[PDB]
Symmetry: C2
Subunit: 449 residues, 2 copies
């Protein structure tokens, strides 16, 4: 019931839809764009389902205007999107591609004209392939390449952008990419991952300073998939495990940014294998942010792992409690969102919070010109209920972005896992608003009240 739900939100609550450059743009060799690490990852057998790539995607490069009109037609106030570094500074370092900047300049103008608020992400995983030559995120120079990139983007767009986030999900860009081998560039090495960790925290810091020098009026933030870690049992071992898991999976990012230090027990275990931390790094990393973005889908259930030699945090996956499952296999368990936010604000001194991603994978398509995705609607109703509870509890929840305006390239899953509020037929590129989308549109349309 979208009307009773709406009553629970503040009149100025910000409702948005979210998207990412490589996931929707296509046009991967157009107008000066050079390859990203995800172009490489996709095209090498073994990394991405069906060897699907980003060559066409949702063809958003060519269709961005229709897509903006759709957002306006849905009555959603805000659009969260990412900027492709491979379009802006195609080799990572090197000459600026003014035609790359022109694309986003035009996009942002289109949003201004339509009253659509802009929440731009500078880095949503599409590192220019050339920078891998230096070591990619394992090299400190890559943080400096980002520093110059951030400045370049904000100099052009900073007069109009409503908000900017430096990074989306360091957890993925760091551990999932350099320790687990699941995301580009597909490494499985603790030294590599620890270097990526510190250099992405540092690049974030560089990005905050750069954006504020060239565009001091734009609210700066950082988007994190903080994990709602829940121990398998109430045993002491599982409790301590949950904490180690929290320090490694969340603390590696939250503690430097919000406390100016790394988690102590993690440094004991892993500190000797870290890159150099120069005198000024932690103070740069921990500059005050104007907001922060939480991406949430599912809890991280953990159990202690007693296996000899097991690297910190020494945990293993614990089974789901709920029996509800999205088509990508993720447990649906809404109250974990509540305990997570509760935990974070207790543990850290945080600015205003926007839910920058929330959504569900369900793969139903078009029948009778419609898409019946009731389980996605239910997912949204339930988690938005939680967000409303957090508002009532007094937490500074200022907005919410649904992950996925439309079905798109879902990283290692390719195009098989659909997250969209809008259905895309990849053969025809036809957009079809789903029932979840119609529902979300009705909710969002009445804001601001």
């Amino acid at each position: 019931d979208h009307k009773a739900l709406a009553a629970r939100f503040p009149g100025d609550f910000l409702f948005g839809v979210a998207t990412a450059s490589f996931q929707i743009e296509g046009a991967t060799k157009v107008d000066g764009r050079k390859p990203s690490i995800w172009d490489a990852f996709c095209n090498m057998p073994g990394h991405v389902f069906g060897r699907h790539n980003g060559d066409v995607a949702c063809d958003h490069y060519n269709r961005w205007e229709d897509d903006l009109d759709l957002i306006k037609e849905m009555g959603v106030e805000a659009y969260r999107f990412s900027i492709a570094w491979p379009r802006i500074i195609p080799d990572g370092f090197g000459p600026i591609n003014e035609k790359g900047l022109d694309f986003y300049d035009r996009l942002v103008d289109g949003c201004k004209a339509r009253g659509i608020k802009t929440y731009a992400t500078l880095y949503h995983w599409d590192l220019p392939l050339t920078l891998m030559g230096d070591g990619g995120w394992a090299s400190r120079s890559t943080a400096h390449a980002f520093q110059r990139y951030a400045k370049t983007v904000m100099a052009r767009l900073g007069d109009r952008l409503d908000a900017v986030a430096t990074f989306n999900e360091p957890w993925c860009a760091v551990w999932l990419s350099h320790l687990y081998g699941i995301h580009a560039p597909g490494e499985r090495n603790m030294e590599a991952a620890l270097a990526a960790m510190h250099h992405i925290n540092l690049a974030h810091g560089f990005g905050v300073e750069a954006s504020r020098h060239v565009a001091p009026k734009v609210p700066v933030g950082l988007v994190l998939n903080a994990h709602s870690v829940i121990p398998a049992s109430n045993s002491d071992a599982d409790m301590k495990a949950a904490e180690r898991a929290f320090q490694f999976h969340n603390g590696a990012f939250f503690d430097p940014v919000f406390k100016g230090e790394y988690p102590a027990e993690m440094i004991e275990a892993l500190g000797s294998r870290m890159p150099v931390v120069e005198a000024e790094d932690l103070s740069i990393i921990s500059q005050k942010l104007d907001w922060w973005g939480l991406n949430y889908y599912t809890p991280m259930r953990v159990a202690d792992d007693a296996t000899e030699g097991a690297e910190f945090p020494a945990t293993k996956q614990a089974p789901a409690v709920s029996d509800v499952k999205t088509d990508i296999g993720w447990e649906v368990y809404a109250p974990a969102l509540h305990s997570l936010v509760e935990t974070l604000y207790e543990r850290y001194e945080l600015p205003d919070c926007y839910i920058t991603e929330n959504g569900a994978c369900y793969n139903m398509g078009v029948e009778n010109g419609e898409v019946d995705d009731q389980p996605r609607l239910d997912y949204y109703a339930e988690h938005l209920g939680i967000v409303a509870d957090l508002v009532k509890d007094g937490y500074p929840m200022r907005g919410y972005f649904a992950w996925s305006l439309m079905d798109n390239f879902e990283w290692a899953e390719g195009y098989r896992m659909r997250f969209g509020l809008v259905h895309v037929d990849y053969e025809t590129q036809v957009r079809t608003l789903k029932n979840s989308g119609k529902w979300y549109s009705a909710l969002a349309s009445g804001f601001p009240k």
Copy 2:
């Protein structure tokens, strides 16, 4: 009869027109990785990502050959060595792999080749010695058929500029390493561990070879064209039917994957029965392009590949396991020293395939002694050479068409995943000062080589 040095007796065993040389590769020696238009290679990436290369050693400086190439040629000349085997850096010539030609890159090798000419040094150029331009990884690298066409255009470009002067050209060095070691075993760049990726690399490298032969002959029909393979000397633990069959599967996978398409115009049957379903598309003219006639071929040999049948259920083709060394004699990199395996390998290859003239394009030993009283006392390296060159002389006597020999390493250099720690040179390089010091093995090789041509 009166006492004679070992090198003098050995020299008498070689024909008067025998070709002696020394060998290098571009990324291993050049340095200057970011100057004059060069863009990164997959090895720059591999080196700089922790975990892949010892000490995270990279090619940024190496032997500084890009700036010292003339000194290095004067060294060859002084050593009395007739031929120089070197590689050309694709990242210097066509820096994005595809795309615009970098004239400054071509100029470097143009000048190098003129320097060799001026000194009377024969040039044996390798077009691809593993330094694929990083940008090509974007389309899938060797897993993408397009890369074979990128190589084709690079080969054509190089040969159109240098073909009037080169004495010989090889398309590829060691497909085995660029394919399996790089895409299945994850040890060389780009560091993949995937049969599908590896099989694609296998065919596309074979295809690229053929494209290169055609391209070279199209624009430089006078240059003898070959291919350099580290063909493995496969030795079963026993002559039990099971081990003899394992040795056959090993041969097909480790050698046949390259020799059969190039020299028979087909892939080995039992390998296809096992791996065919995961191979990329083989188009109509493919095997015909791959199997063009070569003017020579290069054998890289260091150590045998001893194998036994692996009975473990589900074991992927060729389903072998390591068999014990017959000797405890090992180089500092850990490889068994067993010179007779070179005879049995050459005997095997010449009876199984119709081959052109053979040049040993790599042979050498890792021994890590440095400078003491201004000399390098590397007798085990000298011993390794005397023994293996003895085998090469045996092969000449046994009627095999061995035309020449290139000692692997003119000097110490970047040894891939081993970094600078593993030294193969006839000449020592102090990486702090860049000073070159001819080792005792180098003096011995110079003495042998200087007498040729007789």
